[PDB]
């Protein structure tokens, strides 16, 4: 069922500072005490 719920509701997009996020595991290998 298609429903046309009003509109996009004005302009939401604001901005923020992503300090040190977005870090994921690059490979499926265990490592420790190393600056990879």
């Amino acid at each position: 069922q298609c429903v046309n719920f009003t509109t996009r509701t004005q302009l939401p997009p604001a901005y923020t500072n992503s300090f040190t996020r977005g870090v994921y595991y690059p490979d499926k290998v265990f490592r420790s005490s190393v600056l990879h």
Binding site: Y25, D27, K28, V29, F30, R31, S32, V34
Partner: protein, 98 residues
Amino acid sequence: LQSYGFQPTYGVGYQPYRVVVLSFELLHAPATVCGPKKSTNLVKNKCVNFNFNGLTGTGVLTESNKKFLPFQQFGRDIADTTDAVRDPQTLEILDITP
């Protein structure tokens, strides 16, 4: 899209050729499937020729204390050599040193 034309009267090259391609990746992730090679017993504190999921080697086996995360199968040194492994049957962590 353009239509293939395949009839038995066509010669070599124009005939249909069924193709199967495998796109498997190896040994930077835990193994899941392989051949009929049979598992043996486990021995420790002895220089032995181990074989864990296709990774041959030589060294003594000792129960290490490193906590392998479930997506992790291998542990590596500075020189990219394997250092610890999780046995595919018993999920304990074993140190490997030649």
